Amino acid sequence: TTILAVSYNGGVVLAADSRTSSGTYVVNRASNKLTKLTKKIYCCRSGSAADTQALAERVSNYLGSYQTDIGAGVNVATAANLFQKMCYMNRWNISAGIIVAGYDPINGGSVYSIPSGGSCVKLDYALGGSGSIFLYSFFDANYKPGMSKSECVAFCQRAVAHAYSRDGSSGGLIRTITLDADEPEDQTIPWNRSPYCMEKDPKYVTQATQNQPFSSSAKITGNRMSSTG
Amino acid sequence: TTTLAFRFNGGIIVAVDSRASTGQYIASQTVMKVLEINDYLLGTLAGGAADCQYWERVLGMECRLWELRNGSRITVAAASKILANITYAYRNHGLSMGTMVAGWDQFGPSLYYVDDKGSRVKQDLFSVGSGSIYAYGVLDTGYRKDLSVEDACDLARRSIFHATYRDGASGGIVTVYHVHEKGWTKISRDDQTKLYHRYFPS
């Protein structure tokens, strides 16, 4: 699983791969780990699909009740704080790396990582899931804050692609969603149009010279690819 | 611990050592291992000194409440049962406590062993604790019903002494009590090294 959420000026981009895996077999190839809580507050779900779906549905329902009774929009801080309480209360029972991210007119775009402990950290960008570990160095090097909405989406997609190229546990579609003052823009990049994969990267075309014909020289030529030669 | 009681024609002798030992290090050489529940009832503590001290003190409270409510002293049967009911309630709460309730009620002298597992055995002779295996050897060989009170205390005192000499967990002061129709009397309180030089003069 690879989930991330970066802030641009107006709002946020959540991005996620689409693979749930029972270890080494892909149970679902097209999961939607970007889970609506309110109109403009989503979470990205890493860990036990059961546990995060259950929390996301519980928190979505509390936020809907809350929004009805205050008769106003919900702040992302509220969604994050509810999600933290639940992820903390049950920290021993559940496996659930969450990123709450969204727009509210008070604080604009906000990102909250709620990792496995039930910490809630407010961040400019958050990484989550098995694939997160690949991106920390990618962000350190290539991420520049104060991106456009369009640049953030392109970057978030390029990020998720870099993670799911190396993480076995991540793969499939890259789902993004931009949350800002405007109507939410979801989009789904299929793997055959991903911004990066190792399979298409020219760096990794020439094969490792592992096989090597039986020769009268220590000169490494290439792989033996024909029994006649 | 070594702790023995036996019924004979003169009533009940109860004899005990004095040592609390956590296997290796001797905590105390001066533990009172006969609790004096009422004027006519004696407990012995073996195993967990805390567990026995606590639950014999509770037993002593139930025995006193019995005497207040019913205006008559509790029977040994009932007192031994009260304690056997406690240890059975707590049978899988890892109590460690081998106990003897010895008394004289309306129905003459009675001696009961009461375990941590709720066992409640009524016999004429027991020894309880790590040094029982030693006390029993001397006690069974010298035991008759027809012993005088003098000779019954001698037997008891020697039986504890022989446990203190051999058991590492047993030692200190060999206290002997006598339960008779008039209650109990603390017969003797003798250091087991003085007893060695009494019993083996050379």
Partner: protein, 206 residues
């Protein structure tokens, strides 16, 4: 298992033996603890486990049976009834927080006609009961290390029609075969019998 209990049932009595041994690890506390508790005038139970469960179980049965007589204006319950009452009590316990009662019972009784109108079983009844609550009517049966020795010996020598006397002889052979063969010293057996007349304590056999 240490303490062997034996019972068999003939035309006009049930005979029950149970080892006297109460033990603490390897130390015989006594060779003469009575494991055979009389529940009613014509009902008794050779119950074998540690003293704590054996007594707490048997006393609970005995007191509930006595209570059930007090409330039933002195009506003496059948053996099937108390055997079932006992097994339900044992079986309830294996799914309780407390845990099972670790006691194996041979529940013996003589059913007499309880009025003019009684159409029920007349005569001696014997019920094998595991600690789990397994109830089984048997002509004879045994708990303990000595169980399988005596069970085979009884398969060989038990007839349904033995005298009270041929039963004493047979119960002695059974007891003797436990002493001969089990390493746990079962040197003294309490032997009781239930007849039309009630429980009698057999002293001859031990």
């Amino acid at each position: 298992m240490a303490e062997t209990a034996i019972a068999f049932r003939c035309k006009d009595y049930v005979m029950v033996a149970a080892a006297g041994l109460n033990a603490f690890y390897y130390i015989k506390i006594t060779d003469a603890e009575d494991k055979i508790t009389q529940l009613d005038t014509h009902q008794l139970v050779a119950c074998t486990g540690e003293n704590g469960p054996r007594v707490n179980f048997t006393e609970y049965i005995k007191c509930n049976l006595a209570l059930n007589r007090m409330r039933q204006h002195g009506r003496h319950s059948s053996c099937e009834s108390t055997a079932n009452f006992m097994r339900n009590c044992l079986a309830s316990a294996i799914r309780s927080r407390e845990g099972a009662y670790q006691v194996n019972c041979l529940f013996a009784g003589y059913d007499t006609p309880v009025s003019e109108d009684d159409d029920g079983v007349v005569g001696p009844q014997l019920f094998y009961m595991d600690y789990l609550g397994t109830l089984q009517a048997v002509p004879y049966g045994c708990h303990g290390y000595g169980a399988c020795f005596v069970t085979a010996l009884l398969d060989r020598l038990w007839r349904p029609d033995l005298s009270q006397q041929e039963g004493l002889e047979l119960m002695q052979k059974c007891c003797d075969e436990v002493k001969r063969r089990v390493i746990i010293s079962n040197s003294y057996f309490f032997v009781k019998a239930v007849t039309k007349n009630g429980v009698e304590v057999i002293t001859a056999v031990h």
